[PDB]
């Protein structure tokens, strides 16, 4: 199971957001990790490229993976989801409904 | 081919599955029992329009190309037909790729349902290995 927090959050423009995910109830090591965003009013979910303003922290011992998003604006409002990758780092939102990966329950972000 | 249990355990062992990614050989044989009933030709359509192929019921949306599944990614870089051979090599090598990332042997739901948390050594007992 992947526990994703917070479920919902409101931020001011210019703040940063950190989302935390932890893989629990698993006897296997944490593999590759994936992050997805669906912008408010958009309907297409998309993978996030890690790097630059998007900073991932992985801890193998605790099986924790977190994402920091720097310098928020209204354009960042929407829903964010973390999950497990497959095949050595392949990410696709449809993995979240598959038998091959698990995903967090999502973070609904509002930016003032 | 419909394999015998010990026949399959032997083939899986020579193919290097014992303790692969920490999963003892019994896991793999038990997985095949509940996924394909030991039938290399098992071919099961899913409601999303993908298909599961072969002894380990590997799905055409992600892992192989069957020519009929939109959103297909062919992550094992094989035709789905290779997964239906009486030779389990392509299935094993795909399963080894699968299991080395993601959710381990949870990739096989029948493993979760019938194998995880059992005495999997039962599946190789009585076999000359
Ligand atoms: Cl935060």
Strand order of the largest sheet of chain B: 1-2-3
Computed over alpha carbons, the radius of gyration of chain B is: 14 Å
Q: How large a portion of the residues of chain B is in β-strands, by DSSP E?
A: 5-15%
Percent helix range of chain B: 25-40%
**Principal-axes shape call of chain A:** globular
Count of extended strands of chain A: 9
GO molecular function, one term (chain B): identical protein binding
Domain C-type lysozyme (chain B): 1-129
Subunit structure (chain B): Monomer.
EC number (chain B): 3.2.1.17
Give structural notes.
Chain B: It comes from Gallus gallus. Chain B: It is found in: Secreted. Chain B: It is an enzyme of class 3 (hydrolase). Chain B: Lysozymes have primarily a bacteriolytic function; those in tissues and body fluids are associated with the monocyte-macrophage system and enhance the activity of immunoagents. Has bacteriolytic activity against M.luteus. The complex is a heterodimer of chains A (112) and B (129). By secondary structure, chain A is an all-beta fold. Chain A has one domain: Immunoglobulin-like. Chain A is built from no helices and 9 strands. In chain A, strand 6 and strand 7 form a beta hairpin. Chain A is globular. Chain A starts with a strand and ends with a strand. Chain B is mainly alpha-helical and 129 residues long. Chain B has one domain: Lysozyme (Orthogonal Bundle). A 3-stranded antiparallel sheet of chain B has the order 1-2-3. In chain B, helix 1 crosses helix 2. The longest helix of chain B is centred in the N-terminal third of the chain and has 12 residues. Chain B is globular, with a radius of gyration of 14 Å. At the A-B interface, loops of A face loops of B. The structure holds chloride ion (CL). The site of chloride ion has 2 residues of chain A, from strand 3.
Tell me briefly what this model is.
Chain B: Keywords: Allergen, Antimicrobial, Bacteriolytic enzyme, Disulfide bond, Glycosidase, Hydrolase, Secreted, Signal. Chain A contains no helices and 9 strands.
